[model samples]
Target: DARQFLIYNEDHKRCVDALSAISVQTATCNPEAESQKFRWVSDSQIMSVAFKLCLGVPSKTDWASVTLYACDSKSEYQKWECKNDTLFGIKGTELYFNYGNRQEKNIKLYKGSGLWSRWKVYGTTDDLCSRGYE
Candidate 1:
């Protein structure tokens, strides 16, 4: 019953492939699709998304890298930067515009409670970046 549970955060595929060393694009989980499926794998309190990879379509199970996460609740813009970081640039790509990144981390379903969590995948994005990512 949460927004993040529904949609997968996506970046521009063209730009991500162009910046292969720093980033990559995952499958686009359109919650509104007829055959859309999303699964979650949990270890302790940490949970990772189990999604079918899309080779421009749906493929196999994969965890989303550099996506959003929250310890509890929703609508909180949880932000944090690693100590060792570099200014990522792609010649002429803009952040969250020309390309998108959901921050670098995994969504922690819980904290210290110790349990397995099934990811509820059926969400949509409010961004302009949609299918095809062109």
Candidate 2:
């Protein structure tokens, strides 16, 4: 079974959420919210369980906003690696997932040199079908 989880931003105290079809941001962590839930379709692909979309960079440009798109295993922009409490892109660059401020809620890719780049991956009780293990 694919392990469903919540990607939490340690600094902002928010969870990675898909607010709309192409929007991906950090919002309050709610176990009941399917928009904040995700699963690994592959070793590095982080796909939203509700939208069936993968987290990816909108472009190759630095600091590009991370958004949800149709899952494409062949896309390097969708590849990510979580290591040392930091989620960084695997596109041969130094970009890491970054949390935006109040005015800008969208998550972006930036250099992993601050607290905003750090995150915590929490295992949720919910399954792919929103069924709780408990």
Candidate 3:
């Protein structure tokens, strides 16, 4: 049961939209909520692709190709961690998550370097930008 998901780019600190296969960017949101909104729920492949896209990680892997990781946890919304040194996927990669329904919906560089928490999800309507998305 794949579901829609949203992605927030912590580094760029906005949202992710594949403006085009060649025009992806971490730009602003309309209702602001859309910033954290994704297209469909994901299969293991979709989940991994979505994460890599939001991370802005360079990949020869086409957005449509299969990757090495996928969401493996089920907690309504959960965080899944990688326990190995990956050449492509980030080591200690942590995926903030959800599925079947809205629960957790955010992403960021949580497993490395300094404390980076730019990625976040506005699951509830009220959790949206206080500035009032226009």
lDDT of 1 by residue, 51-95 (tens): 222111011112323332333222222221111112221112221
| Clash count for each candidate, listed in order shown | 5, 0, 7
RMSD of model 2 against the true structure: 5.4
Which one wins on lDDT? 2
Tell me the spans in candidate 3 whose CA falls farther than 4 Å from its real position: 9-13, 31-36, 39-43, 47-118, 123-134
The TM-scores of all predictions, comma-separated, are 0.19, 0.81, 0.33
What does candidate 3's lDDT look like per residue over 11-129, in tens digits?
34455444422233445643334323443222212232334332222322212111123333342222222222211123234422111112222222222322133333323322112
Scored against the true structure, residue 12 in model 1 reaches a CA lDDT of 24
TM-score of 3: 0.33
Q: Which candidate is the best by TM-score?
A: 2
